[PDB]
Structure formats: structure tokens, C-alpha cells
Ligand binder design. Structure first.
Ligand SMILES: [Mg+2]
Ligand SMILES: [Mg+2]
Ligand SMILES: [Mg+2]
Ligand SMILES: [Mg+2]
Ligand SMILES: [Mg+2]
Ligand SMILES: [Mg+2]
Ligand SMILES: [Mg+2]
Ligand SMILES: [Mg+2]
Ligand SMILES: [Mg+2]
Ligand SMILES: [Mg+2]
Ligand SMILES: [Mg+2]
Ligand SMILES: [Mg+2]
Ligand SMILES: [Mg+2]
Lengths: 175, 175, 175, 175, 175, 175
């Protein structure tokens, strides 16, 4: 099932990301249930906004906010919910919210899946417009939700992203 | 697995519905197989009709017609086949066909998912139009099938829908 | 799980196909992982081409290329990745590629799902345009992938398709 | 503009149909305004039904119901509203409603646009299932509309369809 | 042409809105060009936001900001760019930006198109959620543009929306 | 009408492209009719291929094949048939077919519509995958159409594209 997908073939450089929410989709926040491994609806978003990239997580990790590391994955076409994509991390958006530090990594499709992203090696290589749209989405998508708040802190590089992956894999194995 | 989802967190007021067919989708009737948990195509509908709401069932229940309780769930955007939604029952369409009594519950998204449906408490709070569209769909969607027949008896209120969930949950323990 | 779907209710005339790629979809090649049962992204296709029918495999078979038998299934509307369809084989497109025989079966929805395909009994009953489109898709969709190539050899009849199903079932059963 | 499209290159065998409503679309009835030539919304349908084929009309015709001849056009993929498709008539569904005799012709794409339909020469050549779904749609799509009623009378052949085209072209030119 | 559509059949209670951007669509801002009547791309939006309702204007009007009156129209399914819908005004969101006063009217489909919106007579009958989503969209959709700024002032009632339509219709006569 | 859209605000650097076929759409080839200005269906393509970018033409130009200059325009989301986009030429794919030279320009959205394409100044700035996909599409999409064929000759730079625009404008102006 989805509960037994590996964190990656070779962490933290070569990872698997379990997709929860397709890029450019309707505003429904899905999450994979840790118990059943099924796709649950978490929320129908109240702002008229959509996740800008496919969104999911790395299995067998535990971040500082209490859940698996969250990852955004840009692709040429949107992926299915519940699919597993091989990726390489290039960057991270740091932000805090009610859950604690809730970082969003960015990882692009591995060169075996496509050579389209081979030229993206670090956070400075992502399009400026994509980075701005991602930050603006996390700054505002919860603006109409009652008990919730976000502060976006800013972008860090691929080395920062990989260290969060190592740390969160270490934390799950112990914890 | 989808076979391991709970009936609900606090039945019968707070339930989980496993979605089989999205609202406003192509006329493919899917059903979750009890053996595998996999989504099986049951039928390509011959009428040019679509389910007016998302359609699914409550896991770990056994209605009078031999299957899990069937539920319609209105949402602001259509859900994925195989996803699980937390809901509150608000009424039931009673109908008979060749499985016997084949009532269709209506449940709305739980207030944790959306504020949109908080003001819907009972069957008289559903829009008249949506009730008429649901009854008309179930009256006509198997018109070009066989020896199927449907007789719609009418709407009952939330207290009756809750009785059907408890009876069918307690029923399935036993069998 | 998808892993425990049967090959068929009555091989070789009545089989189950596990769908990986919907008809007329974006050009993403999904595969079901044999260990986890999850949907993995295999490749983002570089050609501007789409599978002309839903594409999947018969579980618990082992074909001459080392993988379950591959099957195309025409339907009136596209199926979800991960779904299972009951089908009847009508024909096979023999082709070789870069490690070996890699035939593609064609199978139509079973008469219990729809009467639409009842008149298609054999490969001569498939529309000619459809067969030309399938063979053109397989001839060209890996054209931009450097180490890959495809030789299409031609269409054979349902008797040939059914022989392959039984032989491939026995190969998996006995290994 | 759309107001100056010809009825056809060679009536009644070779016609143009102006598409108003795409096949397999949401339940919105559009109509081309005779004054402005713009696409107007005529109705949001209240049943959960969808037109089974692309729907439109032949320009410069005037049927017995007071409007241009209505035509259904099956295609491999849905057409855009406001597009013009070259067709050959193969059949007609006769029905009466509040407007009078309101026949719905069926015409398939001309062989210059595709050879897919070249084998459809008359009403008996259309799939049985398509004809049944078309009749059932016109029998029921107005069931929830207040001041409206339909009686479906039945199918007639291509010669009947072409005579309605000749008659309605004659009636417009005079009237 | 779309340039020849009337402002309305009985202004200001009964109007026509020409639709430019569908509800819940990709973030392409279209506008009808006054010269040609053609649909022109005005902008690819940089935010990951979508218009929460269909968006368009009333033809043959001239508001204080130099353009036709702008109108949001909620519908049960999204409309086509360039289509024309008969509506009734129910309120107005007052806001200023760099065109000056750039109010956005809300109008619902006329009762001849749908019974769904009959019970909405004035601005307090719109769902609170939908009003909040509209205000939040207009507050944030140009966040990543330039020297644009928006200040939302608040909702006024149907009597004020009707005054703005008459003033702008009578205005455009003159100029 | 579409017929009176200008070639450009400042040829050849700043042009308007009238879109006929959206990116990533079903395989229907639309063309704008030069007499009526309507969208006509030209062909249902028999290959399982899609245009890899939006496709259209510059109005009031006359290229060496007797038709307005053809243009592909990459956008972040697909455009509506019949829409007009302001663009800047970056390159041209020279090709011959069965009556003559039939070059295809590539032009990107103008910086007033989006900053995304500002860094694409010339043909060497287009992603290599994209150029390979375009050339592969034009090499193969008429493969099943008996009297048609295509020889791709290669990519030339923006200076070559702009020469063709001006020459083709002068040809239409002077004929
Ligand atoms: Mg969207
Ligand atoms: Mg997460
Ligand atoms: Mg987190
Ligand atoms: Mg059921
Ligand atoms: Mg039941
Ligand atoms: Mg496609
Ligand atoms: Mg194989
Ligand atoms: Mg539909
Ligand atoms: Mg008509
Ligand atoms: Mg009529
Ligand atoms: Mg405006
Ligand atoms: Mg304005
Ligand atoms: Mg040309």
C-alpha cells in the first residue's frame, strides 16, 4: 500500500514523493491517512486559490511540525492523487504556522522520468515567477480559515532542503 | 486499505463516506470490491445522466439490501473516486428496487471540512431543486436496463437517517 | 490491494484488466509497483502523443518480456488509473522492442458492463481507423527516447490472443 | 459572422451545422441569437442529464416549429460552441412538444473531415444504444421544467431527414 | 457581433451580461476588444487564484472608471467566454483601484434561465462564504502586479446596483 | 469580427496571433473561415497526437503557401479557439509539404501579458525538448492521411522569423 513506499532510493538526493493534491486542481485539500493509507478530504478551501504545483510528502519522515516532510513537485502535466514520483530536492520555503515550523520543500522530477528539469540544480534555478506564486499561495490560502495563521519566512537552498530531509528521516526512525 | 476505514468517529452524527462516483462525472458506475478493496467498473451507464452528488457508502455497515449503506454527499467541487469524506447525515431518500429496500442517505461535509453546510440540519433544509434532481435521477438512470425498476417513496428526516446508520452498523457486527 | 485481483473469472475468455493509463489522457506513463501496489510515475513522455485506449495488464500473468500481459481496452469514457475492468480479448498487436517480444492485447468491456462491444468478436471487427491509430502510436511514442525502439509486426486474431493469455497465466503460476 | 454561414455546399446531402452545445458537456442549453449572432444562455437544465451528441442547427432553414432545423452530430471528440461542421444527414427523430413538431435530425461528419462515419448511410446503421440514449434524453431532459412537455414519436430514415431539410430551406427562403 | 448585444431587455431589473472569464477557470484574464468584438488575452495572472464567479460586463454602459459596468454572475456550472446571460442585479462590491472607482456588480441568472436564484433578492441573501471569497479575490489577485493596488470598501444593496446600471447606461448614450 | 484584427501593433516585433487550436487539446483541427469569420472544423485527426502549443495565424499576412502566416504560441495555460494574443516572434521551423513552403513561426506572449517569456529572446532560448516535440509533431501528425506529407528542414532564428512576417504582410497589403 502507500504506507510501505520507501523514503527514496538514495536519500537525501534521490527521494520518492507521495502525491496528495494535483497541480492546478480544484481547491480540495486531500491527505493520506496514516492508519488506512486512504486518501481523506482534509478541507474544502474557502479562498479561490489552487495549489500551484503537485503537493505531497516523503514517507518515513517526521518533520518538526509532527508530520512527514511536505514537498511541492512541478511537472509538465498534473499527477494523480496517490501516485508516487521519483524526485531530487532543489530548495525549501520556510514558514511557520499553528503547527510549528512547517517547511515546504521543492523537488523536481528525477532525470530518469524526464530530462526537462535537469538544469534545475538549486533554488536560484527555479523561475522567479514560480517562487513568487508559491510564496503568495502559502501566505494567503488560509486567510478565510478561522483558527489558522501562517508566516512565510523565505527561500533556502538545496543543501538546506537535503539537511531537512536527513534530519526528518532520522527523527522518524527514532521517534 | 479502504477496507480498514472506520464507519465514523462518532456514529451516527459523525460518519465517514467512502466515495465511489464523483458528482457530475462521466457515466461510469464504479464500486469498491469487498475482496480486494480495488475500484471495479460495475457498469457503463446507457442513459445520458450523471450522479448529481458524489456517491459512496459507509464502511462496516450492512443495510437491508445486503450492501453497505449508500450515501450521497453534496460538495462544492467533485471528489476523487476512492477518497474518504467526513460527513453528517441530514436525511434519506426511501426507494425500493430489485435489491429490496435501497434507501439513499444524504449527508453533508462535516463542519471541520467546510462551513458551507452548517445551516443544513434536516431534510427540509436541502434545496428543493437538489432534492427533485436526486429523485429524478434515481427514477430514470436505469431506464434502459433490463428488468430493473425503481420506485421512489419519498424523503425522511435526519432522525430516520441516523436510525438506519445505527441499525446497519450494529447489523454488520453480528453477520 | 490491487496485488490480489484475480486474472479473470474464466480465462481466457473472461479476464480482469488493471488500468494504469486512461484513454486520451496527458502523456504521463504510470505503472503499478509490484511490491507496494502503488501507482508510480514511470516517465513523462516527450512526444505529443496520448494512449488511444485505456492501458493496463492482467494480474498473475507473466509474459515473455518478464512483465504481466499488457492490454488495451476501448471504452466509451476514460477509466481511472488503478481501476479494474472485466473484459473479453478480441485480438493482439505483435511487436518487438529493445528487450524482446512485447505484444499488446486488445480486449473490450464485458457484456455485463455494456452492450456496446458485443458485436466485436474478433480483430476484424475493430474499426480500421482505431487499429491504424494504435499501431501508429506504438511505432512513434518512444521516438524521442534515445535507447528505445519498436518494431510493429501486425495484428493477430482472438485465438492468438487467448493462447497468449493462457500461456502467460501458466508461466506465472509455475514460477 | 455565424449569421452568414451557408446551409450547405450541396443540400440536402452535404450540409453545414452550426454547433450550439458540445457533446458530453455540463447541462447548459446555449442558443445562437438570430439578431446578434452571439451565443446566449437559454437555460440551466434542472435534470442531471447532458446532450448525448453535439447539438446545433442548419442556418437559413425554417422548420415547422418556427426555428432552424435542429441537428445532432456525433463526433470522436466534443466540438466548440460556435463552430461549423460539414455533415451528411442519416436520420431523424420525430417528436412534438409545446412548439409544435420539433424534429431532431442526425447528421455525421462528412467524409472530408474523417472516414470514421463513412459506413453510416442510414438510420439503421447508427448504433442501437446511441439511438436509445438520444430518445431517452429528449423524453426526459425537460421533466423538471414547468411549462414544457415532449412526446417522442420515433425514428425515420435518411430520405425523411433530407426531405425535412429541403422543405425547411424552401420555407425560410419564402418566409 | 457581441458589440450589438443590448444592455438588457428591461433595465435595470433585467439585463444581459457578456461573459469574458468563466468561473473556476485557468488564470487567463480575457477581455472583449471594443474595436473588433474579439476575445483578447489581457493577462496571464501571476497569482494562483481564479475568479470565483463568471465575470463580464453590460454592453452599452460606461461606468465612472471609463469601461462598461463589470458584473459577477454565479451559476451552477461555468459559462463559455463570449456567451451572453440574462440576469438580475442583487448588489455591488464597492472598491477603488487605479482606474478610480471600480465597483463590481453581482447579478444572478434571470428566473427564465433557472429557478435556483429566485430566493436571492438583495445583497444579504448571498451566502456569506461567497461574499467573503469574492472580496478576498479582488483584494489579492493583483498582489504580484506592479503599481496596482485595490481597496475594498464594502457591499451595497440591489437598489444601489440598479442606480449604477441606469447611470452608466444613460452616461454611455451621451458620450 | 476576427476578420478585422490588426496584424500587430508594431510589426514585426509586436504582433497579434489569432488562435485556432489550443495547446494540449483533443485532436480536432479548426480553421477560421476567411469569408464568414467563423470557426470551421477542418479535420478530425486520425493520429493520437495533439498540438504541443496553441496554433494560429497573423491576420492580414499572406505567406508563400497562400494562407496567413502560421504561428505556434507557448502559454502557461491553453487559450480559447477564436482568441487573440499579443506576441513576439522568436524563431521559425522551416518545413515543406505537399503544396510548398509551409513554415511555422514560434512567438511567445508579449511582456505586457506576462513576464514568464521575457528571457526567451531567440530560438536558442527555447527549451530543447519543446523544439524536439514541435518538430516530431509536424513530422508525424499527417502520417495516416494518404495524400499528405511533411519535410522538416530545421529551426531558424528570430531575424529569419521577422523577415518572413514583414514579407508576408507586404504580400497581403499589395495583393
Ligand atoms: Mg482550476
Ligand atoms: Mg503533509
Ligand atoms: Mg508540514
Ligand atoms: Mg452501494
Ligand atoms: Mg443500497
Ligand atoms: Mg489530451
Ligand atoms: Mg509487455
Ligand atoms: Mg459531464
Ligand atoms: Mg434549434
Ligand atoms: Mg426544433
Ligand atoms: Mg471590465
Ligand atoms: Mg470597472
Ligand atoms: Mg502555412
Amino acid at each position: 500500500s502507500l504506507l510501505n513506499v520507501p523514503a527514496g532510493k538514495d536519500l537525501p538526493e534521490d527521494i520518492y514523493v507521495v502525491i496528495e493534491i494535483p497541480a492546478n486542481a480544484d481547491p480540495i485539500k486531500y491527505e493520506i491517512d496514516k492508519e488506512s493509507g486512504a486518501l481523506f478530504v482534509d478541507r474544502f478551501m474557502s479562498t479561490a486559490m489552487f495549489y500551484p504545483c503537485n503537493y505531497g510528502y516523503i514517507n518515513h519522515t517526521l518533520s518538526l511540525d509532527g508530520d512527514p516532510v511536505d514537498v511541492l513537485v512541478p511537472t509538465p502535466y498534473p499527477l494523480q492523487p496517490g501516485s508516487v514520483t521519483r524526485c531530487r530536492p532543489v530548495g525549501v520555503l520556510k514558514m511557520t504556522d499553528e503547527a510549528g515550523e512547517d517547511a515546504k520543500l521543492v523537488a523536481v522530477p528525477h532525470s530518469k522520468l524526464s530530462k526537462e528539469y535537469d538544469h534545475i540544480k538549486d533554488v536560484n534555478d527555479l523561475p522567479e515567477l514560480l517562487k513568487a506564486q508559491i510564496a503568495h499561495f502559502f501566505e494567503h490560502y488560509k486567510d478565510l480559515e478561522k483558527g489558522k495563521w501562517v508566516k512565510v519566512e523565505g527561500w533556502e537552498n538545496a543543501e538546506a532542503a537535503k539537511a531537512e530531509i536527513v534530519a526528518s528521516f532520522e527523527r522518524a526512525k527514532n521517534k
